DNA sequence: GCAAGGTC
């Protein structure tokens, strides 16, 4: 039988496909063999030595502690042995372990990033022989990449594979620990065992929900005053909002007074003409971003269709920072394939638009083990609707990052009042070329109705208008902008963030308030809870500050022992100042879970403070007489109308708005 | 039991 073999060296994937893509690379009929009814490949003419290729699924291998309190060791163990979720993995364990005994030598191709170099390194360590192992180094998942990689086998990068250890050393340490004091805290006071988790990513995420979600519900909108104007000239009667504003509404209407019944000439023309730049292609955060805008999907779903149409090979790997093709990826491919498919038409356009070469609009940001999200050029075939808008956006957010910038026309007048130093330009678009426009046509540009002025043309200022302004909030969270602040402040990855957020709703922390997210009272008190006995947990700098040491663990810059010593002073010294205090943590949290049930505030269900009003309550009177005070500065209305316009406001906090009703009968 | 991180 050809699955027969021996004498071989045993190359590593990260993931079937990945395997199965490194097994074309290196022969033209590599040998599909299947075990523990896992698929891997046999290569028994590549310049003659023998290969096999085999996938893991992801980690094998996780950290494993003692139970209780507090633990600061940790063994790595086989996943199946330890979690059944992730049961999966035994039969790759299984297929990995044969495979290793009869090859003679171990390469860790899985992806070239610090947690592909800890599980190849894990698998190899354990169930083959790290001695004779070495590391394959590829981008991307091209034929030339995959050979190029295969000639320049290296030595294992430990330095890479120590900072991925320290990483999970690090996350097992803080993220275990203080769960378990939260949960064991509650379980000495109230005698209750209940499910509560704290981490370096979830924690952050957390307390920013809450935080914004307070300072949104305290919120008062403060007045200011701009002024518009009615220009009348010629045929034309234009509106125009001055760049100017006011505190005072007095001040204001001076201005205003000043403006009415002056004159106004047009000083310049300018007819320029501008190019609006052609998208790059997506990272998962883009896509996510924007399927949630056009679509409403949250980015957990987007995440897990864009991996089902890649497992599907109609896209290329999803879990993506890089918004960059290499050139190693075959553009005229992909072409080749959207025209054979519905998308044809599209291809006509893009081919017609650049003369019939196709250059991709290369993003910013970049990914060590993958480039951006684009289709293989796969035609689809029986896509739900919901999977393929998914797709749709992918094929043209690439297509239109292939096609050409599109080509706006502008006419600029400027205008100045005559007898005062007043400019103000009046502007109308013009799309000459839409292009990508046109692809990617998911951006509205607005074309104004032309309005035709010359140089020396007067107009009379006839009329106008003081217009307050309140300021704003904060806006709400959404499950997506929540994302895209976690991908801002670098917290998790491609894969973890969705997943992460739907933690902090399983553990009933936040919840859905329809389009929104919204903090639960058990999520106030965590996040109280956790600023007051671990607040590095709670601050996004803990995951800076690990990145920078865990930098400097690859570079060589510093060793992963005092990384993870330092680490633990700071936990314990927590752990040893929390269990003094570990009777008022369960206690926080017995009231958080309502075990200890309290005098309600008189407008809602927090624990009544002072007055009658829970803290928030409270507080919302302090600012809202505050405010009131300063709306009468400026606007001079009489309390009842300022009263009324505030609750008219959906600007105003929701705990302000209970005490301005109260306030008005 | 709990993290964050791979992938299924
Ligand atoms: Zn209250």
Not at 264 to 271: A, D, S, Y
Not at 359 to 384: C, F, R, S, W, Y
Request: glycine share 4%.
């Amino acid at each position: 039988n050809l699955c027969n073999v021996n004498n071989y060296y045993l190359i590593i994937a990260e993931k079937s496909k990945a395997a199965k893509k490194i097994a074309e690379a290196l022969s033209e009929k590599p040998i599909l063999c299947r075990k523990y009814n896992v698929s891997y490949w046999i290569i028994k003419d590549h310049n003659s030595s023998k290969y096999v290729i085999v996938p893991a699924a992801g980690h094998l291998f996780g950290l494993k502690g003692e139970s209780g309190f507090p633990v600061y060791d940790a063994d790595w163990k086989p996943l199946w042995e330890i979690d059944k979720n992730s049961y999966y993995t035994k039969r790759y364990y299984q297929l990995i372990s044969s495979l290793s005994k009869y090859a003679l030598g171990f390469i860790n191709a899985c992806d070239y990033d610090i947690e592909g170099s800890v599980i190849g390194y894990l698998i190899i360590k354990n169930l083959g022989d790290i001695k004779k192992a070495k590391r394959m180094k590829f981008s991307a998942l091209t034929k030339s990449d995959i050979l190029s990689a295969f000639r320049n086998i290296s030595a294992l990068d430990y330095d890479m594979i120590n900072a991925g250890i320290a990483r999970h050393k690090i996350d097992w340490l803080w993220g275990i620990n203080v769960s378990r004091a939260l949960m064991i805290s509650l379980q000495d006071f109230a005698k209750k065992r209940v499910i509560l988790s704290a981490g370096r990513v979830q924690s952050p995420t957390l307390v920013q929900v809450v935080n914004s979600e307070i300072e949104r519900n305290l919120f008062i909108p403060l007045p200011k005053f701009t002024v518009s104007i009615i220009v009348k000239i010629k045929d034309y009667s234009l509106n125009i909002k001055v760049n100017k504003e006011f505190e005072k509404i007095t001040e204001a209407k001076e201005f205003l007074n000043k403006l009415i019944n002056k004159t106004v000439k047009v000083v310049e023309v300018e007819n320029r003409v501008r190019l609006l730049e052609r998208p790059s292609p997506f990272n998962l955060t883009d896509l996510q971003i924007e399927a949630g805008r056009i679509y409403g999907i949250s980015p957990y779903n987007v995440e897990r269709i864009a991996e089902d149409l890649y497992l599907d090979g109609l896209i290329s790997f999803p879990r993506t920072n890089s918004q960059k093709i290499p050139s190693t990826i075959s553009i005229y491919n992909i072409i080749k394939g959207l025209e054979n498919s519905s998308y044809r038409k599209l291809v006509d356009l893009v081919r017609k638009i650049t003369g019939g070469k196709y250059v991709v609009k290369q993003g910013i940001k970049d990914d060590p083990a993958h480039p951006a999200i684009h289709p293989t050029g796969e035609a689809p075939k029986n896509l739900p609707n919901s999977k393929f808008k998914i797709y749709d956006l992918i094929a043209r957010r690439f297509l239109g990052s292939v096609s050409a910038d599109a080509k706006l026309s502008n006419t600029i007048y400027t205008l100045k009042v005559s007898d005062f130093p007043l400019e103000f330009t009046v502007s109308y678009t013009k799309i000459l070329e839409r292009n990508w426009l046109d692809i990617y046509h998911f951006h509205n540009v607005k074309e104004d109705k032309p309005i035709f002025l010359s140089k020396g043309d007067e107009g009379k200022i006839v009329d106008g208008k003081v217009n307050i302004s309140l300021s704003k909030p904060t806006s709400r969270y959404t499950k997506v902008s929540l994302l895209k602040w976690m991908e801002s402040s670098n917290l998790g990855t491609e894969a973890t963030r969705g997943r992460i957020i739907e933690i902090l709703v399983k553990r009933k922390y936040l919840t859905n308030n329809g389009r929104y997210i919204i903090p639960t009272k058990l999520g106030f008190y965590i996040a109280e809870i956790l600023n007051k006995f671990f607040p590095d947990i709670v601050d996004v700098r803990m995951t800076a500050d690990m990145e920078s040491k865990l930098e400097m663990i690859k570079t060589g810059k510093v060793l992963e022992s005092k990384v993870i010593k330092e680490n633990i002073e700071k936990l314990n010294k927590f752990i040893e100042e929390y269990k003094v205090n570990k009777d008022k943590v369960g206690e926080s949290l017995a009231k958080a879970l309502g075990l200890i049930k309290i005098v309600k505030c008189k407008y809602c269900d927090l624990e009544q403070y002072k007055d009658g009003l829970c803290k928030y309550h409270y507080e919302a009177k302090v600012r809202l007489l505050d405010a009131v005070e300063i709306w009468k500065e400026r606007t001079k209305y009489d309390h009842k109308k300022i009263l009324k316009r505030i609750s008219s406001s959906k600007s105003t906090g929701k705990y302000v708005k209970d005490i301005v009703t109260y306030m008005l009968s």
